[PDB]
């Protein structure tokens, strides 16, 4: 026969499958809302049956973050990337979220470096623009999206900030292997006005300065 849970739990299961179907078409907030529903529903009716469509959950859960990852690790424009990192983030990941987001931001800058030593000066300026222009952005954009979500998540942004700028520096000390006074006002520059987003490495620029003074001149 049939009971009243064994309704609401088969329709569960419909529920779960749909889940692959809106994966499919691409519908990733769908996916998140309905998986979430599926899951808060779940818990409420918390045997065989419901043990059974947990597993299923997770399963999609699962495939969900999956493509959601591929997704935020891929995208073009900013619009692709905030959805994807918010649905990440709905999903209740938003580390993992954040952590792939700063990648992508990360890639965006190997790759753009790659697409260019002409002369000395033409390099390192161009250098610090690509750099600390998708560093400011990036921390532009991390506020209109990871907004209220903690004083850790927005730690670990400032850490991919400082590593940013390390890596900078990285490029130079390698060039270095074979500086000028007309590239240092345009990096400082370029890390002033970092503070128009909340960070100061102004630090970083003096103390990479006073072991290369040889070097400057």
């Not at 990360?106 to 697409?115: E, R, V």
């Not at 520096?169 to 970092?194: E, H």
């Amino acid at each position: 026969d049939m009971s009243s849970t064994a309704q609401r739990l088969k329709f569960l299961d419909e529920g779960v499958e749909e889940i692959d179907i809106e994966l499919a078409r691409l519908r990733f907030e769908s996916a998140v809302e309905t998986l979430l529903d599926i899951e808060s529903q779940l818990e409420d009716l918390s045997l065989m049956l419901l043990n059974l469509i947990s597993l299923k959950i997770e399963q999609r859960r699962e495939a969900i973050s999956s493509k959601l990852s591929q997704s935020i690790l891929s995208s073009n424009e900013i619009v692709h990337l905030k959805s994807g990192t918010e649905n990440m983030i709905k999903l209740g990941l938003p580390e993992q979220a954040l952590d792939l987001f700063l990648q992508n931001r990360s890639n965006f800058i190997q790759d753009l470096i790659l697409q260019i030593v002409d002369n000395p000066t033409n390099y390192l300026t161009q250098l610090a623009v690509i750099r600390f222009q998708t560093i400011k952005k990036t921390v532009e954009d991390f506020q209109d999206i990871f907004k209220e979500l903690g004083a850790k998540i927005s730690s670990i942004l400032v850490d991919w900030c400082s590593d940013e700028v390390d890596n900078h520096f990285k490029l130079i000390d390698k060039q270095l292997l074979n500086l000028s006074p007309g590239s240092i006002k345009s990096s400082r520059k370029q890390i002033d006005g970092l503070k128009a987003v909340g960070l100061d490495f102004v630090y970083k620029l003096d103390e990479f300065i006073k072991k290369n003074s040889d070097k400057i001149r």
